[PDB]
Design a protein around this ligand. Sequence first.
Ligand SMILES: OC[C@H]1O[C@@H](O[C@H]2[C@H](O)[C@@H](O)[C@H](O)O[C@@H]2CO)[C@H](O)[C@@H](O)[C@@H]1O
Length: 326
Amino acid sequence: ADWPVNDEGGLALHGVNISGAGFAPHITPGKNGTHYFYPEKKHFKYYADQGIRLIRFPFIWERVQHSLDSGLNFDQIRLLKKTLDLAAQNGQKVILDMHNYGRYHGELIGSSKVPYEAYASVWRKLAERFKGHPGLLGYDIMNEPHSTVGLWPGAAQAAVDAIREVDDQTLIFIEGERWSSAYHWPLVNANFLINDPADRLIYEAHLYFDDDFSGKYMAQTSRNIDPMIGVERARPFIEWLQKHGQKGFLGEYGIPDDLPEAAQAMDNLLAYLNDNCVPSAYWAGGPGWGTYKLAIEPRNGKDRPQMELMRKHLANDCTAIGPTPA
Ligand SMILES: OC[C@H]1O[C@@H](O[C@H]2[C@H](O)[C@@H](O)[C@H](O)O[C@@H]2CO)[C@H](O)[C@@H](O)[C@@H]1O
């Protein structure tokens, strides 16, 4: 709905994931500044300066709620509020992403140890904290569910119901099973459907270019990247979206800076996304990435090759989030 817009027209479709509040997730709670990191004004200013108004921001449940019998961590909420504040001051809107893989402290959401009600409450409580914030675009209620033994769809509806008890205005982003793979979407999530009477739900998949779909880009699995593998891995998902009359988001995709074939695949993917008015978020920019080959964070004030590749694709004349249903 209130999707960010570009200055010369169109929508802010193509954004960035920003580190690093979900870093080192096995270390909980860990310490801010050591194990995980939050961005500063420089990051939001840089990406705004590049014409980027969309940000996906991972965090983990374990740092907002250390235990199910505990309330929310005040400082972590304050850190997320700061993130939303700095985004909004720079004309950006943020997707808060609970980067939790269908699990809480390693146990499955929907298991006896982590009931659906515990997930619903945390999202209800989080939505109470951030309801109405100008820099908030919506809630990516779970990153990359996998091996959830049938538990993910019920958990997603429990969180949505709870969120809509307190906030009927924020967008909600729904990922699917099999790590929310875009290529596998029509087979894994063939009959996947969450109920949102607000009509403010978007489905979200991830897509990488290596042979095992993982985005790790190991040497043996990254030797033959077709220039169209990005379009081929997006199309199943887009086609499922069009058939079900639903809106999409490619929440992660990224390439190493040393694979020319990956560059071509990214250019053709973003072009295809634009043709369908489908937004995306590059993985990843922000603090703490060092020389990570996929990182789009500049170094020495030198733009990264992936930022330079993104720029040709920012302009559009879309007025609604797609794809366009049949
Ligand atoms: O990274 C996103 C991407 O993961 C892809 O599959 C991987 C998974 O990421 C990896 O950790 C696991 O061990 O094996 C699989 C093999 O694909 C995944 O298919 C996509 O859903 C996901 O978007």
